[PDB]
Amino acid sequence: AECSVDIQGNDQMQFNTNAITVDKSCKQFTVNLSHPGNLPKNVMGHNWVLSTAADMQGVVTDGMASGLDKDYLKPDDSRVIAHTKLIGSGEKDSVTFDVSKLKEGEQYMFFDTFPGHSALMKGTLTLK
Ligand SMILES: [Cu+2]
Ligand SMILES: [Cu+2]
């Protein structure tokens, strides 16, 4: 099975997809994030952040409260399973994580924690 996915976030506060599936037989999984557009990070920064569905609200609320110099994530937030950096237009960042962190029967969400973006920039992550 493939073990990576390419995700884009644009100047329109959109991701290219709202559903990612991770095949069990992957030991690691990589998300490659890019930002088409022209807007810089402080105004249209995007990141890809993974937690359980239950934790998504907290991560987003705490991240937004943390500010740009924290890339909009609360320091030491243990609800965050994996994430990319916050990137502005033209930049790119990849994260690779251990698939063993993810458990059967759990609901996962990926999302962006830049202020307001999770309204649109979120999706499900499913183990298969
Ligand atoms: Cu494979
Ligand atoms: Cu964003």
Curated annotation (Swiss-Prot):
Disulfide bonds join 3-26. Keywords: Copper, Disulfide bond, Electron transport, Metal-binding, Periplasm, Signal, Transport. One of its GO terms (molecular function) is zinc ion binding. Residues 1-128 form the Plastocyanin-like domain. Cu cation binds at residues 46, 112, 117, 121. GO terms for cellular component: periplasmic space; plasma membrane. Its main location: periplasm. It is found in: Periplasm. Transfers electrons from cytochrome c551 to cytochrome oxidase. This is Azurin. It comes from Pseudomonas aeruginosa (strain ATCC 15692 / DSM 22644 / CIP 104116 / JCM 14847 / LMG 12228 / 1C / PRS 101 / PAO1). The lineage of its organism: Bacteria, Pseudomonadati, Pseudomonadota, Gammaproteobacteria, Pseudomonadales.
